[PDB]
Amino acid sequence: RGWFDLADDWLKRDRFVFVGWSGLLLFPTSYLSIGGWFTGTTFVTSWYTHGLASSYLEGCNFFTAAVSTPANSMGHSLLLLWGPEAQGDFTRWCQIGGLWAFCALHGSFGLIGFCLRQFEIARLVGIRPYNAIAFSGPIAIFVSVFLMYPLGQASWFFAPSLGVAAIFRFLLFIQGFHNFTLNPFHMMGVAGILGAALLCAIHGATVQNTIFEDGDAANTFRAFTPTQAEETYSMVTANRFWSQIFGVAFSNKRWLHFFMLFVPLAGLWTSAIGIVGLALNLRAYDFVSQELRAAEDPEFETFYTKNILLNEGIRSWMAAQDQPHENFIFPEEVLPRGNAL
Amino acid sequence: SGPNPNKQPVELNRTSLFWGLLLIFVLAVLFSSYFFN
Amino acid sequence: NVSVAAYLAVLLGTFVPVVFLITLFIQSEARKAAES
């Protein structure tokens, strides 16, 4: 038939790994992003961007190695290898943090390709595409945290660097400079994630503990056959159990699974809204009434004020080394301390 | 004009009502401190 | 030293969605009782 038809037939072949049309975008972008992350964590340094060593070659381990964000002198530049910053020089491109931009961009396009892959495969198996809508959660997380937040900030420098200790630094930095725990959208995100973990554990235990005795063996994993029209566990027994233990219980399996889908997705989207708010420093950092009460009453103290003091200490004691481009020099006298208070 | 054939009835079961009331009250509890600031 | 419309926002954003849900549920129960 037509070239398209033949190419569509070949891409849709039942192989070990489905390729599809979405594969043409997913496989190269994802492969390049992963390989660039490995290359950065193995060879590329962060000495000229953050003043840090972040490579196995420099002596870092799995936790401390990272693909660090570009230098604060770059701004929100695409940092193309052929761009005016690098001008085709691979060494200077790696030294200025261009590999982080490479990984971030090709990884965003890889996430788009994987979402399209979920859509394509759902259209072939003939099922509703409730995947690639669940994956919209992680997509929103990545877009808000690694793309929208640095774009709202001064440069790519304040984006999370692709590493374990780098991610921990990013957590503490955001807590210090934004008080992100106090953000209600982050609270909804935490509630969503913890509730999703709760739902996963409780649903697994409930199904495992309400199975029908469909086998004579003590180990009951064999009593489930792959094409089973009958239900393998008692929904009525599980309903009665939770109705009389917790006071409320699921009666519709459909609803239950949609709820288990909905909770983490809603949590991730709320956290994404909160991070988008943080991108412009539009943060729920402080309560004005509490600050006014503490200002006119030195004997008034709450855990919120202690958190404010902790955030101030974090900012003051991490600014010098976390933002070396600013050339912050803070004398010991102006550094906040508990005794200094 | 005339009777429209697209009119359909809306249903909210009690589980949905309780889910909605709980969501609204929990959102109010969460955002009241920030609105009062 | 709290705000003022603050109370208006909290109370209305609590009530407007609550009375909407209650009205919808009462309408559904009315349909169920009428049909049955």
């Binding site: - | 009690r14 709980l22 929990v26 | 109370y7 109370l11």
Partner: peptide, 30 residues
């Protein structure tokens, strides 16, 4: 006065939980 609003919201949530528990739609086999 905001304490009154906070207490009202908390008890309303507790009452919603109470009514959801003891006035739910009774499950039946169809």
């Amino acid at each position: 006065m905001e304490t009154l609003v906070y207490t009202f919201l908390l008890i309303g949530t507790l009452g919603v939980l109470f009514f959801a528990v003891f006035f739910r739609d009774p499950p039946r086999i169809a």
